[PDB]
Design a binder for this molecule. Structure first.
Ligand code: ECY
Length: 150
């Protein structure tokens, strides 16, 4: 499964970049072109979604009661509940990743930067295993970037 690897890489780099603030060096593996502008798409749109959804994001974060990695292994079930209810679109998916970034910035504050990698993997696993076929019909991240062009 490569869609898992491509998605995980995009989600990881965006979350860590949000958490840290550095636009990261390093090679963007393979198929980097689509992944590069989805990440660039996430920079432009995802952070604004966080601004537009700040109240419930702060509320959700306060109720989740995140402290360590053993909390992360329980966030998936709440993620699966809030996310999988309804019909699929890219707005839901960019919202999913946006709150992951919100959680990532919080995790750094409480000095829990090592937990950003499970989160992104939990996010990635929740997305593909529930939206795989749809992501294939939408041509994956190509249809993502095509959707969010400016
Ligand atoms: C990383 C992580 C992520 C998690 O979940 C990510 C799911 C994304 C998400 C959604 N919602 C969220 C809320 C929220 C709000 C807003 N109000 N209330 C009451 C709540 C609960 C708070 C947080 C996240 C979400 C509510 C409605 C917005 N949609 C559907 C939708 C449909 C159509 C158009 C749009 C559009 O805006 O374009 C959006 C969501 O799927 C969970 C965990 C545990 C973790 Cl650790």
């Amino acid at each position: 499964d490569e869609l898992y690897r491509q998605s995980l890489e995009i989600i990881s780099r965006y979350l860590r970049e949000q958490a840290t603030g550095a636009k990261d060096t390093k090679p963007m593996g393979r198929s980097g072109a689509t992944s590069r502008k989805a990440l660039e798409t996430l920079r432009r749109v995802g952070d604004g979604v966080q601004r537009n959804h700040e109240t419930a994001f702060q509320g959700m974060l306060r109720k989740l009661d995140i402290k360590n990695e053993d909390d992360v292994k329980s966030l998936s079930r709440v993620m699966i509940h809030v996310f999988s209810d309804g019909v699929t679109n890219w707005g839901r998916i960019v919202t999913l990743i946006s709150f992951g970034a919100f959680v990532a910035k919080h995790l750094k504050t409480i000095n829990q930067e090592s937990c950003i990698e499970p989160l992104a993997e939990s996010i990635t696993d929740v997305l593909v295993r529930t939206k795989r076929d749809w992501l294939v019909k939408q041509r994956g991240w190509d249809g993502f970037v095509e959707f969010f062009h400016v």
